[PDB]
Design a binder for this molecule. Sequence first.
Ligand SMILES: [Au+3]
Ligand SMILES: [Au+3]
Ligand SMILES: [Au+3]
Ligand SMILES: [Au+]
Ligand SMILES: [Cl-]
Length: 129
Amino acid sequence: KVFGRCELAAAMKRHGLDNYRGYSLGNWVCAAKFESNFNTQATNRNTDGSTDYGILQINSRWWCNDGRTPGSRNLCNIPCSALLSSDITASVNCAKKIVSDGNGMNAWVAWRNRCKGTDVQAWIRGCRL
Ligand SMILES: [Au+3]
Ligand SMILES: [Au+3]
Ligand SMILES: [Au+3]
Ligand SMILES: [Au+]
Ligand SMILES: [Cl-]
Protein backbone atom coordinates (compact mmCIF):
# COMPACT_ATOMS: atom_id res chain seq x y z
CA LYS A 1 0.00 0.00 0.00
CA VAL A 2 1.22 3.52 -0.78
CA PHE A 3 -0.28 5.86 1.85
CA GLY A 4 -1.10 9.48 1.40
CA ARG A 5 0.53 11.80 3.92
CA CYS A 6 -2.58 12.62 5.96
CA GLU A 7 -3.87 9.07 5.56
CA LEU A 8 -0.68 7.81 7.19
CA ALA A 9 -0.81 10.42 9.91
CA ALA A 10 -4.28 9.28 10.81
CA ALA A 11 -3.38 5.59 10.91
CA MET A 12 -0.34 6.34 13.03
CA LYS A 13 -2.49 8.28 15.51
CA ARG A 14 -5.09 5.49 15.54
CA HIS A 15 -2.31 3.05 16.62
CA GLY A 16 -1.01 5.37 19.34
CA LEU A 17 2.19 6.64 17.75
CA ASP A 18 1.38 10.34 18.11
CA ASN A 19 3.60 11.76 20.85
CA TYR A 20 4.86 8.25 21.62
CA ARG A 21 8.08 8.66 23.61
CA GLY A 22 7.55 12.41 23.10
CA TYR A 23 7.79 12.27 19.28
CA SER A 24 5.03 14.26 17.61
CA LEU A 25 3.12 12.76 14.71
CA GLY A 26 4.98 14.85 12.10
CA ASN A 27 8.24 13.20 13.22
CA TRP A 28 6.79 9.76 12.48
CA VAL A 29 5.31 10.88 9.13
CA CYS A 30 8.61 12.51 8.13
CA ALA A 31 10.52 9.34 9.06
CA ALA A 32 8.13 7.21 7.00
CA LYS A 33 8.39 9.55 4.05
CA PHE A 34 12.18 9.28 3.81
CA GLU A 35 12.42 5.64 4.85
CA SER A 36 9.79 4.25 2.48
CA ASN A 37 8.02 7.08 0.61
CA PHE A 38 4.94 5.83 2.45
CA ASN A 39 5.07 2.41 0.73
CA THR A 40 4.30 -0.49 3.12
CA GLN A 41 6.01 -2.97 0.78
CA ALA A 42 9.43 -1.27 0.66
CA THR A 43 12.38 -3.61 1.29
CA ASN A 44 16.08 -2.64 1.10
CA ARG A 45 19.15 -4.83 1.55
CA ASN A 46 21.93 -3.51 3.81
CA THR A 47 25.64 -4.00 2.99
CA ASP A 48 25.91 -6.28 6.03
CA GLY A 49 23.34 -8.78 4.67
CA SER A 50 20.41 -7.61 6.81
CA THR A 51 17.29 -6.11 5.23
CA ASP A 52 15.01 -3.21 6.14
CA TYR A 53 11.27 -3.73 5.91
CA GLY A 54 8.16 -1.66 5.48
CA ILE A 55 6.97 1.85 6.08
CA LEU A 56 9.61 2.48 8.76
CA GLN A 57 12.39 0.29 7.25
CA ILE A 58 12.81 -1.92 10.30
CA ASN A 59 16.03 -3.89 10.22
CA SER A 60 16.31 -7.68 10.41
CA ARG A 61 19.69 -7.37 12.23
CA TRP A 62 17.76 -6.79 15.46
CA TRP A 63 14.03 -6.48 15.23
CA CYS A 64 12.41 -9.07 12.96
CA ASN A 65 13.11 -12.52 11.58
CA ASP A 66 13.62 -13.05 7.85
CA GLY A 67 15.68 -16.26 8.19
CA ARG A 68 18.64 -14.95 6.20
CA THR A 69 20.39 -12.56 8.59
CA PRO A 70 22.97 -14.68 10.40
CA GLY A 71 23.73 -13.66 13.93
CA SER A 72 20.73 -11.45 14.01
CA ARG A 73 17.99 -11.12 16.58
CA ASN A 74 14.16 -10.81 16.44
CA LEU A 75 13.29 -8.46 19.29
CA CYS A 76 9.82 -7.57 18.00
CA ASN A 77 9.07 -11.30 17.77
CA ILE A 78 7.63 -11.14 14.28
CA PRO A 79 8.44 -12.29 10.80
CA CYS A 80 9.82 -9.40 8.78
CA SER A 81 7.09 -10.06 6.19
CA ALA A 82 4.51 -8.81 8.73
CA LEU A 83 6.10 -5.40 8.41
CA LEU A 84 5.02 -5.23 4.77
CA SER A 85 1.28 -5.42 5.46
CA SER A 86 -1.25 -2.82 4.28
CA ASP A 87 -2.25 -2.63 8.00
CA ILE A 88 0.56 -0.84 9.81
CA THR A 89 -0.16 -2.37 13.28
CA ALA A 90 2.86 -4.64 13.33
CA SER A 91 5.24 -1.89 12.11
CA VAL A 92 3.90 0.54 14.75
CA ASN A 93 4.19 -2.01 17.56
CA CYS A 94 7.77 -2.73 16.59
CA ALA A 95 8.60 0.95 16.10
CA LYS A 96 7.41 1.61 19.67
CA LYS A 97 9.97 -0.91 20.94
CA ILE A 98 12.72 0.56 18.74
CA VAL A 99 12.17 4.15 19.82
CA SER A 100 12.22 3.03 23.47
CA ASP A 101 15.60 1.29 23.17
CA GLY A 102 17.47 4.42 24.33
CA ASN A 103 18.44 6.52 21.27
CA GLY A 104 14.88 7.61 20.54
CA MET A 105 14.24 8.28 16.83
CA ASN A 106 18.00 8.42 16.02
CA ALA A 107 17.60 4.68 15.42
CA TRP A 108 16.28 5.82 12.03
CA VAL A 109 19.28 7.35 10.31
CA ALA A 110 17.03 9.03 7.69
CA TRP A 111 15.07 10.64 10.54
CA ARG A 112 18.29 12.04 12.05
CA ASN A 113 19.63 13.16 8.69
CA ARG A 114 16.44 14.53 7.14
CA CYS A 115 13.80 15.15 9.84
CA LYS A 116 15.48 15.93 13.16
CA GLY A 117 15.35 19.61 13.94
CA THR A 118 13.25 20.50 10.88
CA ASP A 119 9.68 21.83 10.75
CA VAL A 120 8.19 18.36 11.04
CA GLN A 121 4.69 19.76 11.69
CA ALA A 122 4.44 20.54 7.96
CA TRP A 123 4.02 16.77 7.44
CA ILE A 124 0.66 16.91 9.20
CA ARG A 125 -0.28 20.43 8.10
CA GLY A 126 -3.80 20.42 6.72
CA CYS A 127 -4.64 16.94 7.96
CA ARG A 128 -8.00 16.15 9.62
CA LEU A 129 -6.79 14.45 12.80
AU1 LIG B 1 18.00 -14.90 10.43
AU1 LIG C 1 14.25 10.79 23.02
AU1 LIG D 1 4.21 17.50 14.42
AU1 LIG E 1 -3.61 0.48 10.91
CL1 LIG F 1 -3.46 0.75 9.13
